[PDB]
Design a protein around this ligand. Structure first.
Ligand code: 77Z
Length: 563
């Protein structure tokens, strides 16, 4: 069973692709070593194709079937509803790719006769036909990274595979409720997407402390989407079908599974046949839910095979971390080899070889790790951080280019308590917003794969709600964290933190002069900058903002808009 077969036709871009970091008058203030930042293009698609194309062997034992039975029993308690055409239409992003059948995303959102009637026709076809493969478009992703020597230096572009807009709206009708509600029921506390950043830290810290002698490890599956087999996708559907569903929903789900999710023909941007997929499509509604379930199933069974004691898992898509009871250094090493052997048999072999870790702060999961700082009272506060290299490289790109998704805003929200987000990201971008008088302008960014329109003036309310008032007063960061940030700044040629402190005093003063919500941004987001701090009190506007739906489920690749 080959993950892909290829015709020879190239993966083509839809427009001009930039690989070199764009530079304007503002670039140098953030980053000096411009040659270190690059974007992935279709020119490296061939290299990705070779990496993602392989034979999958699967050997399924009693542990696997045992866990599946338990998952199905939980799934059987879920009652899910079909979305109406209108409800599905409103979940479509305004700038989502247009249909090849004579309408765009804005037509869908406006409930135009042409769009709605076509969607009805696609739905009718799904109910009637459960065999005919549905067309997909294959594209190379344009993503910004910093060069990383020993990784081959530069990573090839990721492959995105997605069906037509009409099909995407139909996916929503059939499965939006399922993928939003089922994962937490089946996986419980192990489902990562139910957690805000602070809630994730809470879960990780509490889990670590619950063990007598804790040991943890992240498990990196090599090219997870390609490891997903027809079996896996059919198993996922069987889980979905355990739900209390309308007969209509059951038919649509069965059809989508057979015709889209299991595999299908690949078409480039020019309309040429590129080949065939027999693995996970990155750009469907069930991608996040399917991957989390599949990873959870394989990992749970692998934990049993390895006889891991008092196991606790945390799963987000392909991203897996396990915390358990240590049996000793040699014993743990042996246990992880058995775990890896089990995962490999299930068709989930490792990329990075898994290693036991006895320091929670050194465990990276969802590209992030738990670190410790101190609040204004001097009390230890745990928070989520990461290596700032990619965030800052993407911030550099967004400084000189308008982008659909503003990664900097998402990074400020999710990493608000961090040294680097506060000192660099907040300072840099609020200065930009002040200069253009664009503080009031709402910006698009993605949280857990879903698109949100967010006003930067709401940041103090957002940060207070998610991270607490402590996020505005954190100090005395860990030596490891300080060292990592320092290494990043040297690498990228970012001005030292002392320069950022000086700049922040100016940014703060400007914001305070503006009045209104801008003054609140100055007071709260930049209280770290001044030597004599203010009191900091709860914001009345914070409880008014609707933050439900932010941390319920993952929707990466699912074409989801929540506003
Ligand atoms: C864990 C989280 C609190 C911190 C890291 N983080 C994240 O993990 C995500 C995120 N997580 C995640 C993990 C795994 C994942 O796998 C999807 C797959 N199909 O394998 C997809 C996602 S996401 O939903 O695309 N986004 C994210 O969107 C994000 C955005 C801004 C800032 C931080 C983010």
């Amino acid at each position: 069973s080959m993950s892909y077969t290829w015709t020879g036709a190239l993966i083509t871009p839809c427009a001009a692709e930039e690989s070199k970091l764009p530079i304007n008058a503002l670039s140098n203030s953030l980053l000096r070593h411009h040659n270190m930042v690059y974007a992935t293009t279709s020119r490296s698609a061939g290299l990705r194709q070779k990496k993602v194309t392989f034979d999958r062997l699967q050997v399924l034992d009693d542990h696997y079937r045992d866990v599946l039975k338990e998952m199905k029993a939980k799934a059987s308690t879920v009652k899910a509803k079909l979305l109406s055409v209108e409800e599905a239409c409103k979940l479509t992003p305004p700038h989502s790719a247009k249909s090849k059948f004579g309408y765009g995303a804005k037509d869908v959102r406006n409930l135009s006769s042409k769009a709605v009637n076509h969607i009805h026709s696609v739905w009718k076809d799904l109910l009637e036909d459960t065999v005919t493969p549905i067309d997909t478009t294959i594209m190379a992703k344009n993503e910004v990274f910093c060069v990383q020597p020993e990784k081959g230096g530069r990573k090839p572009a990721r492959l995105i595979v997605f069906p037509d807009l009409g099909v995407r709206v139909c996916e929503k009708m059939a499965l939006y409720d399922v993928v939003s509600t089922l994962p937490q029921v089946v996986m419980g506390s192990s489902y990562g997407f139910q957690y805000s950043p602070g809630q994730r830290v809470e879960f990780l810290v509490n889990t670590w402390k619950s063990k007598k002698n804790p040991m943890g490890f992240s498990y990196d599956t090599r090219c997870f989407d390609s490891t997903v087999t027809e079996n896996d996708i059919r198993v996922e559907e069987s889980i979905y079908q355990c739900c209390d569903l309308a007969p209509e929903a059951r038919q649509a789900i069965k059809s989508l599974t057979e015709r889209l999710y299991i595999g299908g023909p690949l078409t480039n941007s020019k309309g040429q046949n590129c080949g065939y997929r027999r693995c996970r499509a990155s750009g469907v509604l069930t991608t996040s839910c399917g991957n989390t379930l599949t990873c959870y199933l394989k990992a749970s069974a692998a934990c049993r095979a390895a006889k891991l004691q008092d196991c606790t898992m945390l799963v987000n898509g392909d991203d897996l971390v396990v915390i358990c009871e240590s049996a000793g250094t040699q014993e743990d090493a042996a246990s992880l080899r058995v775990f890896t052997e089990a995962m490999t048999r299930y068709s989930a072999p490792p990329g990075d070889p898994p290693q036991p870790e006895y320091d929670l702060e050194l465990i990276t999961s969802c590209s992030s790790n738990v670190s410790v700082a101190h609040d204004a009272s001097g009390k230890r506060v745990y928070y989520l951080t990461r290596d700032p290299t990619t965030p800052l490289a993407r911030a550099a790109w967004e400084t000189a280019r308008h982008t659909p998704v503003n990664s900097w805003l998402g990074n400020i929200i999710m990493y608000a308590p961090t040294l680097w987000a506060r000192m660099i990201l907040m300072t840099h971008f609020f200065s930009i917003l002040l200069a253009q008088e664009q503080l009031e302008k709402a910006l698009d960014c993605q949280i857990y794969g879903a698109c949100y329109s967010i006003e930067p003036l709401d940041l103090p309310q957002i940060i207070e709600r998610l991270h607490g008032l402590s996020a505005f007063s954190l100090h005395s960061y860990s030596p490891g964290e300080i060292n990592r940030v320092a290494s990043c700044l040297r690498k990228l040629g970012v001005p030292p933190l002392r320069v950022w402190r000086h700049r922040a005093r100016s940014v703060r003063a400007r914001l305070l002069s503006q009045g209104g919500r801008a003054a609140t941004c100055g007071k709260y987001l930049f209280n770290w900058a001044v030597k004599t701090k203010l009191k900091l009190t709860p914001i009345p506007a914070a409880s008014q903002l609707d933050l439900s739906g932010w941390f319920v489920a993952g929707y990466s690749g699912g074409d989801i808009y929540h506003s």
